Design a protein around this motif. Sequence first.
Motif, PDB file in Angstrom:
ATOM      1  N   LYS A 170       0.725  -1.149   0.424  1.00  0.00           N
ATOM      2  CA  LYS A 170       0.065   0.399   0.147  1.00  0.00           C
ATOM      3  C   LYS A 170       0.868   1.132   0.061  1.00  0.00           C
ATOM      4  N   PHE A 171       2.153   1.496   0.258  1.00  0.00           N
ATOM      5  CA  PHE A 171       3.097   2.266  -0.223  1.00  0.00           C
ATOM      6  C   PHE A 171       3.133   3.242  -1.469  1.00  0.00           C
ATOM      7  N   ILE A 172       2.653   2.660  -2.984  1.00  0.00           N
ATOM      8  CA  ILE A 172       2.822   3.223  -3.506  1.00  0.00           C
ATOM      9  C   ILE A 172       1.174   2.972  -4.734  1.00  0.00           C
ATOM     10  N   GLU A 173       1.244   3.721  -5.450  1.00  0.00           N
ATOM     11  CA  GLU A 173      -0.041   4.800  -6.031  1.00  0.00           C
ATOM     12  C   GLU A 173       0.165   4.622  -7.483  1.00  0.00           C
ATOM     13  N   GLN A 174      -0.798   5.793  -8.074  1.00  0.00           N
ATOM     14  CA  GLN A 174      -0.430   6.394  -9.282  1.00  0.00           C
ATOM     15  C   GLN A 174      -1.719   7.234  -9.598  1.00  0.00           C
TER      16      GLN A 174
END
Lengths: 281, 255, 255, 61, 61, 59, 60
Positions: free
Chosen positions: F50-54
């Motif tokens: 859950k530590f990266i998203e775009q």
Amino acid sequence: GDVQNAVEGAMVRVADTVQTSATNSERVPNLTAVETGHTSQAVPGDTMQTRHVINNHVRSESTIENFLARSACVFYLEYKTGTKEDSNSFNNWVITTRRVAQLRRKLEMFTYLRFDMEITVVITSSQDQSTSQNQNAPVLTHQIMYVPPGGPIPVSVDDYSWQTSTNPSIFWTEGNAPARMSIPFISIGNAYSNFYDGWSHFSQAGVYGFTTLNNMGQLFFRHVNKPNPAAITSVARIYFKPKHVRAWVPRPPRLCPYINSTNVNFEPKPVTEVRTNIITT
Amino acid sequence: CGYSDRVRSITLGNSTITTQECANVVVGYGEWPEYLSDNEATAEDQPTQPDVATCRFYTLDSVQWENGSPGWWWKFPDALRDMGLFGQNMYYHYLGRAGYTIHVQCNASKFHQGCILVVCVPEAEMGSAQTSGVVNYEHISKGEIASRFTTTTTAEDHGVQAAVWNAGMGVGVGNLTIFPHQWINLRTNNSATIVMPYVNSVPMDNMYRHHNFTLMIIPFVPLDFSAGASTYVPITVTVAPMCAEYNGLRLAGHQ
Amino acid sequence: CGYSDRVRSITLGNSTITTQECANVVVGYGEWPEYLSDNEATAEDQPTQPDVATCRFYTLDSVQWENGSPGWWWKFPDALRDMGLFGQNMYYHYLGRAGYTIHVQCNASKFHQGCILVVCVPEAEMGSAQTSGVVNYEHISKGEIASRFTTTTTAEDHGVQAAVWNAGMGVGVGNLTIFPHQWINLRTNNSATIVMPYVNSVPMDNMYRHHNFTLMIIPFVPLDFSAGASTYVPITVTVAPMCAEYNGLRLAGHQ
Amino acid sequence: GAQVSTQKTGAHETSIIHYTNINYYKDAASNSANRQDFTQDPGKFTEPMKDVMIKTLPALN
Amino acid sequence: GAQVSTQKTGAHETSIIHYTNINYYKDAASNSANRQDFTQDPGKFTEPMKDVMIKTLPALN
Amino acid sequence: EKDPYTNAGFVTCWYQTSVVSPASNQPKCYMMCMVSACNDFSVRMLRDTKFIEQTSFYQ
Amino acid sequence: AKVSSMEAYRVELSTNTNAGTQVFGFQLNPGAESVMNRTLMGEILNYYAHWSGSIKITFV
Ligand SMILES: CCCCCCCCCCCCCCCC(=O)O
């Protein structure tokens, strides 16, 4: 032996009846004391003269495996073909087995249950009425995504989450045989626990009951296709089949109807149906 | 021989119960309690085993059986929380494991009648009187004081549904017999002995949060006697822990 | 080799003390503590031995060493009466037997000087400030809080005579060295370790009535340092029970 | 490496027909349900006694 | 020319089930993922020393 | 993931004696804490982080 | 302020502090506790839903 080796079997048959004759003995085989908590082992030959009979009956549809291993419907979920502005363009289901009445009652006959599971899912679509309901549309693909506990959650039909870099997903086109996966055993204990009498907090508080242990992630469902000029509603029916089952500690069957799927609450019902008199033909 | 099978002596620790009327002794599911093996260990720290100091017969409170009374239940291990060094070890340790010898005592003369079911139900999760409500601790146990069943469906707020005939958990009372049970039928025996082994789905557990099993005493045939033949007949439940071992030592507390 | 004799690690139970400056370890009278034999038993009942649960390093209170301070004493086993499951077993049992590892900790930089005697006196019977008076409990021990010596002869009513130079028991302080002792002389070591075995004239005894030995810490050379080089230097006494076994179980109480 | 085993068939008037099974997957979970195994043991439930009770003798004597 | 190998199965209370695999293509690239191989060696990362260090001895002496 | 059912207890640090210094030296100093997994450790049930998203494709 | 700087890593000790004073405390629960959340061990953990094992904290 191993219950995941399915080609290895065993065989046993129901007991025979040996012939007996009249007696005038000093032994009583049909007197016993219930108090003991011991079930009598009387057999017909002890109180009648019986002939010799050979039984070739075999208990074979009362094995735990054969009893539980049939695909039950656990839940169906509905979702339309939409845009990002809709909040019904995708949908999700928190995995549990307590929603349906039938399968629940079967499982709850054993306190501890250990099994692998085959999940099959039948997705059916229908045309919604509209002015443009004779619009042409090609075949629709559907995506089923499993999100394990504490993973990212979709906030819309279209966002990064759906990339699924390590989440298992099934893409299934309509007009094919139903999608099917097998799942291994997945508890952090040594068996699934259908009943937990206890509290989530050491101060004897919080949540009472089975809820505390269950936690299995969620299934997110969406359409893969871009919207057509009219909505199509789809309803996915989820089927579960427990295979390779082992069961410990039998419990009495349920009598009262269920009310909630987060607790065992009930309101008291009559023991059994009334009959006309204590002597009845 | 000179033996009779109506006399039995159970000595455990520095405590001996004798009984001169009994019918055998039920060993729960055929298995005698024993210590955890090294194939089923999960905890790494060395267990303490207090042996003789924590294994011995703790006599809990005794309630009076009357003609109208509907039944009683106690929840283990929760009930034993004030009993001597068992209580203390349980208070200072995160994990505990133990089996138990449950010995229910009652007696009467020949001119009394009545029959009680004595059954040890593992994992008895109980309903709530209000079916939108949620039960809380104080109506689940009173410690070592018996929780009473009721014969009237209505009950207070956070009351547990405890109408006798549905066993307080939505199953017909007549089927409770599937769990390890005996009967004290006044005329034959006058005591029950159930040696309940540890049954759980995980090797050791926290003694406060989890309640391993509930001892239910339900009178199926009411106590009756003819006038002027005594009116007070108590039922005393005595229980002894067996093979108790504890892992994870830290400061005393609940939270 | 790669060994040095200045580093030592004592692990007992779930508690490990390390020290990187020490001078050996004094085993009291050459004998290592161990369990009672069957040739010296008197009690007939089966002893409990809690092993790991009651053997482990209990850190007692730490007092500050100052230039003027005269010394401190604690009385064992009395001091340990609130320490965890040791305390509990001692509370519920008539008879107890155990040896002890006494580990006194202190430290300072190179620009401090001062030297403390660390001595374990068995059977230290103490006087009374008023020589017609009789001492009472509260001036003999404060539990786990250190009893202070005084450098002024006068004292309150039921005061214990505690003028440093006569050790509080009428013998010249300079001869205390005959009992198992070490010295923490700041410059060399910075800890003392005395493994005191059980010494009594009778095989087991009651833990409340009898006081087996007194740990006396007396500064023979006063703490001194030059200006602006820290002013707070505490002395922490950590003690671990060894081979503790208890006979005679009954209800908790003193009387 | 095929496995051969006997099919369920009823009794006959006064036999053995085999079938073949091969596993195609690397995880034991993927295997077919173990429907053949008829072993049982009522003992644990029907007689959970300490002292053996002989049927022909009186229960309490 | 079939190959036989053992399936992943957990532990049991105090075994071996095989599966069969045959390759149908001419290029090793087409083969199934090699998911069974649990060999490891922390050594290169956890102790990249020149002189061996004995756990029980002081690190610097 | 944080869950009430499983907790792993509390790690605390305390002054056993005190920090003592000589004459001319700084009063305050610092410690640092390393963390690692022991030689028996394992993980199961692979899932997304859950530590990266775009919000769109990178360019 | 200290979290966007090197300050974050250094725990401050001081001379002339009374004995039995807590330096720091936090509950252990890697991969959900902020302290160990973004360390090497933490980062690896957050790709899994189940862990097991023993942890070793080296105080320098
Ligand atoms: C597309 C991938 C789907 C993967 C689905 C994973 C489903 C996990 C199923 C868990 C079943 C748990 C049964 C619990 C039984 C019980 O205790 O009542």
